Amino acid sequence: TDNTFVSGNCDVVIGIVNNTVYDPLQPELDSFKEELDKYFKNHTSP
Amino acid sequence: TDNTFVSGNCDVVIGIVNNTVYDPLQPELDSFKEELDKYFKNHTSP
Amino acid sequence: YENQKLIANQFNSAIGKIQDSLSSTPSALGKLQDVVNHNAQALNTLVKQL
Ligand SMILES: *[C@@H]1O[C@H](CO)[C@@H](O[C@@H]2O[C@H](CO)[C@@H](O[C@@H]3O[C@H](CO)[C@@H](O)[C@H](O)[C@@H]3O)[C@H](O)[C@H]2NC(C)=O)[C@H](O)[C@H]1NC(C)=O
Numbered sequence: 001t002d003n004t005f006v007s008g009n010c011d012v013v014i015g016i017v018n019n020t021v022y023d024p025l026q027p028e029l030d031s032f033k034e035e036l037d038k039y040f041k042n043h044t045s046p
Numbered sequence: 047t048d049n050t051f052v053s054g055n056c057d058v059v060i061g062i063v064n065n066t067v068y069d070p071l072q073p074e075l076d077s078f079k080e081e082l083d084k085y086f087k088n089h090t091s092p
Numbered sequence: 093y094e095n096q097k098l099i100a101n102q103f104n105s106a107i108g109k110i111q112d113s114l115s116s117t118p119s120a121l122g123k124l125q126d127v128v129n130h131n132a133q134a135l136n137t138l139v140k141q142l
Pocket residue numbers: 016017018
């Protein structure tokens with residue numbers, strides 16, 4: 001995301017291809033927001 | 047870490063020094079981890 | 093920085109060829125050779141008309 005900027009939808013550009021954009025916020029979240037789900041099972045599951 | 051950009055390991059630059067890069071997303075998150083761990087302590091309190 | 097040993101080695105190799113190529117081609121300094129050739133020869137034909 002730090003290398004790319006967006007402008008509008010993706011149908012007007014001629015020759016645009018399909019690929020994902022690696023959002024760097026997600027590894028900082030999926031290693032920590034998913035860690036909350038394990039802490040949710042600390043009291044709910046037993 | 048938004049003022050700087052990274053490239054590879056630090057074993058190739060001649061004259062590189064040691065310092066700490068202040069990530070700005072962490073202390074907003076880590077203070078929220080303190081509230082979440084307090085909430086998780088509140089989750090496991092009863 | 094990741095290539096300074098290569099860049100510093102390549103620059104000194106390129107600057108070493110300037111010392112050889114300047115004393116190889118004879119007309120390299122032809123830009124300065126004809127500014128003194130034209131002035132001396134026009135001086136020569138000035139006194140040749142006496
Ligand atoms: C990049 O991926 C997108 C997926 O989001 C591709 O869009 C897909 O394009 C096809 C074109 O044939 C769509 O099929 C058609 O859908 C319409 C309804 O919108 C339907 O009436 C037709 O019978 C036909 O099935 C497909 O639905 C659409 N995908 C989605 C999720 O809407 C796009 O083509 C890809 N581009 C490249 C360059 O690979």
